[PDB]
Amino acid sequence: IPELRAGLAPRDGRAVEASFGQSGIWLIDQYLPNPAAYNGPFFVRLPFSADPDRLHAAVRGVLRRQEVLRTTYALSDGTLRQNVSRDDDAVVFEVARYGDDKELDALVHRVANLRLDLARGPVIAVTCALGPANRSAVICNIHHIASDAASAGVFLRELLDAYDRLGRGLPVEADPLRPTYGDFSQWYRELMNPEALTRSLDHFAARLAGELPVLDLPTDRPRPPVKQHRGGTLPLHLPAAAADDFEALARTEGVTLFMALVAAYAVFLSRHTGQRRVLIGSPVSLRDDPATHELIGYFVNLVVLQQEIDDRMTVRDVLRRAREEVSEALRHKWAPFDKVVERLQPPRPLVQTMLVLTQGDAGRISHDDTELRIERGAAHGAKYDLSLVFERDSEGLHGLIEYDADLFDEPTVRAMGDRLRHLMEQFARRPDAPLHELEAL
Amino acid sequence: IPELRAGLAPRDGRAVEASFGQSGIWLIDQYLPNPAAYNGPFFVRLPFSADPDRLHAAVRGVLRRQEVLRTTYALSDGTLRQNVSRDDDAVVFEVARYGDDKELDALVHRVANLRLDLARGPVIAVTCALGPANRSAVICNIHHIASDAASAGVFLRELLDAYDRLGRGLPVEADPLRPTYGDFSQWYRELMNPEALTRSLDHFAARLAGELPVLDLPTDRPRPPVKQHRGGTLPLHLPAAAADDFEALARTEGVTLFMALVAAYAVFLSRHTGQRRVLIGSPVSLRDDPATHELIGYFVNLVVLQQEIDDRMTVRDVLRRAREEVSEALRHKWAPFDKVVERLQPPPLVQTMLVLTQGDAGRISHDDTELRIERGAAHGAKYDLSLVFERDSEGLHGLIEYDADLFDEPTVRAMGDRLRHLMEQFARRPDAPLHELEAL
Ligand SMILES: [K+]
Ligand SMILES: [K+]
Ligand SMILES: [K+]
Ligand SMILES: [K+]
């Protein structure tokens, strides 16, 4: 797998083609809300009161060092292109006040519900929120065509570094040795040469051949003709003990934590739908190369995982079947989801639910000897029926549910969450047990 | 002024043309937020824990009795039509929970940010919010084309009444003797016959002739090429004392409270813009006839008020000049705003607005206890800023709705402070020339 190098894309001024991910995203954009909350608008509470003018000047420094934040999109002869502008002030900005968490959440909602223009920009909004005493907060919305979950950490590190440099009178400018998102976009297209792309597509086309199941969850309402794009969230409240045991199960059985969650979630879905086969989408990070680790952009590909469940399999059986499914999918993870879709020709996609695992250390930023936390807003467009979003660090494993309120009332979701965390507790307690001997509630 | 009668529009099934207001609203409709907060998504805290299934059944009863909630819109031969459906379940509904004010505001925000489809519907969203103890809340979003500020009280009275009737096994059905929004729409077109419409348009075309000023407020940011539809709100915090004196000022000088607010706001704007002439829009209620008082719909027309201010006029001068401008404008208030705009051909007309509601429309009685109608704070900032006043039994108060594309909040807080200061001075020195009312 070749290394990403700066200058791969023409540094002459010619506009680079959008990456596989940007192209799929641009196609669907209808000025909807952010599809998901885990990778959406965010904020960080500061243990000082930030100066608004210098914070704004720090933001312009971040735009200079982060080329995707100055990028708009347009078709040029049948090809979508990334048009980079020199204007480091293309940000939707405001200074506002709050006195408590409710007032802060009101400011977050305003930022989170912007519907940014991809043709003209800006693609980023920032609010400098002034709190009581020595408190303040930065609120940020980056359009998902220009970001992913990890981008939030990148943005805040760049912003706090620029803030501090500008305070010391130092300059804040682009790193010419760092690759851009345009370089990564070209690198991705070179990686997916025609033979390598057919090979990876061929894999998923074989795995997902035939009549695929459509997730059949019990709902409070039928799917409406008009989607209203109204997402809810609900924390799992997975007990710390059960969470620690679930992590212990994973390593004891030789599976990653993610493989374990995928298996338990598949069992949960199989029970609730009465369906043997379940499909779970997962957004896999493409940040393998460390040259991507300080770049804002869409460094993700959605990968489809298929599992077959029945209640005579044991916990250990499903863990090991998830290990094989995840292993092969990750081996072909560079297959762009939208080309997988095009190759499969479903009845117009593939997946109606998603599972995500983040390392909680990506939501932790050190600044001036203190630790800061990246917090997500709760509002989203409910792209899927429901998405399980897990985060694990040394301090423990925890999760939340993002759900489509067009289908579910919140107590239904709380009941689902209640069964899922119970199941996960039984998984760790009885790896040898057949699933039918794991009793409900 | 003819009476509104039920059956004015054919009860045969032929689709009535949209009202003047609905037409203007439909033309602009993209998929933007509610333009303003004062007339936007709302909620009411209930002193019991509502039963979700019966509350949903109550909502279907309101749809049956309130025909605009079952209306969608579509052109048919160059004419916008109100297509009424019999589906009393066309509502964006959910049941959700809250344990404190923050969690409730989270449920309000989700309802408030829906972008309802005018061609397909639903045009209404309702959330049955289950709180702690024996407490709950109803959260509601009705599209601007199908409502006005007063509609929220109509909706909630209908809802609580239906809820109780369904509890006692009684039926909840349409009142055939009550006119519909379709009747009002046809009544409005008959009222604005060609001669009567030309007369009212002629009035505003003469009053508003020439090069109109464009509100020139100091902003923190220039007006952006891409509007982001990001509204803020800021409470004015008008002291009870000054608010009472201000009301007392109005009565003593023989002007309505609204007239007094219009004068003080115009003075405030002239000072902040450096402009002698200021235009203020005001949404005027068209619910004169008591036959409209239990109807949900857009019963409003925007009217443009023009005022000339300089600092040698006294408080009493601007009060009496506001009296004449408002009196004449109200006399021609049926002239549809969009037709006034078409007649004037601007390069619309007003960049700011003033509203006065009677807080008795924001207060409803249920089983001996009084309930308050509360507005969300999110909106699309249709105007640079809008001053929203409400006068109830407890006093007079106001808030500012503002465009965050232009203003940071501390700028708006400083404006609200100068406007509140000015209004106190108005009441203290009605004889004084304005140049003797010093800032701060
Ligand atoms: K502070
Ligand atoms: K505030
Ligand atoms: K909740
Ligand atoms: K309750």
Author numbering:
A (entry chain A): 80 to 427, 433 to 525
B (entry chain B): 80 to 426, 433 to 525
Question: What does the study report here?
Answer:
The crystallization construct comprised residues 1 to 533; however, the first 79 residues did not yield resolvable electron density, resulting in crystal structures of only the BC domain (91 to 533) and the preceding 11 amino acids. In neither form was there observable electron density for the first 79 residues. As other canonical C domains, TomB80–533 consists of N-terminal and C-terminal lobes, which adopt a chloramphenicol acetyltransferase fold and are arranged in a V shape. Two crossover elements extend from the C-terminal to the N-terminal lobe: the “floor” loop between β8 and β9 and the “latch” loop between β10 and β11. The catalytic tunnel is at the interface between the two lobes and includes the conserved motif 222HHXXXD227, where H223 is fundamental for catalysis. In both crystal forms, the catalytic tunnel of BC is wide enough to accommodate the ppant arm and their substrates at both the donor and acceptor sites. The tunnel is ~38 Å long with a minimum width of ~1.4 Å at the bottleneck, as measured by CAVER 3.0 (29).
Nonribosomal peptide synthetases (NRPSs) produce small peptides as secondary metabolites in fungi and bacteria. Tomaymycin is synthesized in Streptomyces and Micrococci by an NRPS consisting of the initiation module TomA and the elongation/termination module TomB. TomB contains a C domain (BC; TomB91–533), an A domain (BA; TomB534–1055), which functions to load the ppant arm of its PCP domain (BPCP; TomB1056–1141) with 4-ethylidene proline, and a reductase domain (BR; TomB1142–1535). The C domain binds two substrate-loaded PCPppant domains—termed the donor and acceptor PCPs—and transfers the growing peptide chain from the donor PCP of the upstream module onto the aminoacyl subunit carried by the acceptor PCP of the same module.
